[PDB]
Amino acid sequence: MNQQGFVISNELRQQQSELTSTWDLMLQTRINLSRSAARMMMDASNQQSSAKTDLLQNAKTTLAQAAAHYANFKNMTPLPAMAEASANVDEKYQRYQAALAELIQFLDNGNMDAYFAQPTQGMQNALGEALGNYARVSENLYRQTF
Amino acid sequence: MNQQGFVISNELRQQQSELTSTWDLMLQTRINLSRSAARMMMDASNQQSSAKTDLLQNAKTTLAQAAAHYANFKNMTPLPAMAEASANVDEKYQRYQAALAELIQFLDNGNMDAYFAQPTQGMQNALGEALGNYARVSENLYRQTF
């Protein structure tokens, strides 16, 4: 229907929002984990809450928040035009969320070797790429509506 | 003019694009610097290009790319409705771009102490916040046009 433009617009609006929230968060989680891993050597110092003192904790919350965000995005059924794009993103998200979930495990148990061996970058890049696509396909939509 | 909707739309389209590119990049630069700082201790190993071996180099390019992006955004005069928002973002960007430029200096000269003392987070958060505003004000625009 004519007036339905807004309901199908705000939907494609929130799909983009929380999606950019997820990325912003996993991107902030990887930096938090590095601040913990970096300081888990010569410049340790802090004894109160050893290991999980400050940034490790902040990196558990940031992933938790990115999980909460995406959970909504996945809750919304993708438009027929965006089905193949949404899936590509979902898959790429699975790998990277997992990668970070394991980096948190690694930092919890002092597994530095494991930490620095996982090729986290490729999985981050794989997700960004899928994101740029979804966005392209997504913006195109409105342009194919004005 | 009536048809001008597209020229004023695509403009507010690219302003948002390259702006999200900048953030994505500084967010990727801080993670690169941590990978370098983290490994600039027990798990060094690599002798080819010591210090500036891999991630330090990648972190110079990512900032360089984020600089290139924003340079465009700043090149575009802000709409009367977005002037006060664009400025708030500019300022907050100045602090954080600088913060990262110095973390690169720190990692180049082995200044680990300086590296872990700068309160990078507050400046990142200060920028994200200003970004959420600009976005709000920016999205509102089209909604105040449909």
State the CATH topology of chain A.
Four Helix Bundle (Hemerythrin (Met), subunit A)
Radius of gyration of chain A: 18 Å
Head-to-tail CA distance between termini of chain A = 15 Å
Tell me about the largest β-sheet of chain A: none
What kind of assembly state do the chains in view correspond to? homodimer
DSSP strand (E) fraction of chain A? under 5%
DSSP helical segment count of chain A = 5
H and E order of chain A: HHHHH
Query: What portion of residues of chain A is helical?
Result: over 70%
Q: Which class do the helix and strand fractions of chain A yield? A: mainly alpha
The H-level CATH homologous superfamily of chain A, spelled out, is Aspartate receptor, ligand-binding domain
| Count of discrete structural domains of chain A | 1
- Total strands of chain A: the figure is 0
Identify the CATH architecture of chain A. Answer: Up-down Bundle
Report the largest inter-chain contact: A-B, 26 and 26 residues
Rough outline of chain A: elongated
Per CATH, the class of chain A reads Mainly Alpha
How would you portray this structure in words?
- 2 copies of one chain form a homodimer.
- Chain A has helices at 5-39, 55-75, 83-108, 112-117, 120-143.
- The first copy, chain A, is mostly helical and 146 residues long.
- Chain A has a single domain, classed as Up-down Bundle (Four Helix Bundle (Hemerythrin (Met), subunit A)).
- In chain A, helix 1 (5-39) runs antiparallel to helix 2, helix 1 (5-39) runs parallel beside helix 3 and helix 1 packs antiparallel against helix 5 (120-143).
- The longest helix of chain A has 35 residues, at 5-39.
- The radius of gyration of chain A is 18 Å and the shape is elongated.
- The A-B interface holds A 5-6, 9, 13, 20, 23-24, 27-28, 30-31, 34-35, 37-39, 41-43, 112-113, 116, 124, 128, 139, 146 and B 5-6, 9, 13, 20, 23-24, 27-28, 30-31, 34-35, 37-39, 41-43, 112-113, 116, 124, 128, 139, 146.
- Chains A, B: Residues 2-146 are periplasmic.
- Chains A, B: Residues 30-39 are annotated as: The 3 Arg may form a positively charged pocket, which binds the alpha-carboxyl group of the attractant AA.
- Chains A, B: It is found in: Cell inner membrane.
- Chains A, B: Belongs to the methyl-accepting chemotaxis (MCP) protein family.
